[PDB]
Amino acid sequence: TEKRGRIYLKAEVTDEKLHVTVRDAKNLIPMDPNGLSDPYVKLKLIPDPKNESKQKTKTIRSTLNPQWNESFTFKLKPSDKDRRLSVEIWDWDRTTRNDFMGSLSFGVSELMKMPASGWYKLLNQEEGEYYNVPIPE
Ligand SMILES: [Ca+2]
Ligand SMILES: [Ca+2]
Ligand SMILES: [Ca+2]
Known part of the structure; x- marks a missing residue:
């Protein structure tokens, strides 16, 4: 909700597994x-040097206010203590590289001391790997 729009998310760490719900997004930037x-x-869980944690929602065509309503689960291990949940919105392009739209991230430890929920x-891109900005109201 500021230049790149906002996204509604849910993410909680319930013993063993990280559960993430990607609801919808609004006011995304035109990239077509x-x-x-x-x-x-x-x-994604980062860092991901082996590149194995990647999960993705479906692509919604021709919209700046997509509503995915999809949930995901990451098995966690003690090694994940220092990792972050990366959430990146991308613009699927058929004839060129996909365009970056907006992102954010949460510390696995951060989420364990308080599940994320609401608008963000x-x-x-670069900064999205380092923090998040909740938008209460
Ligand atoms: Ca594009
Ligand atoms: Ca496109
Ligand atoms: Ca492109």
């Missing part, structure tokens, strides 16, 4: 010639 985008969300401001 038609003035829209084809948004999908990529969920979409951040730039």
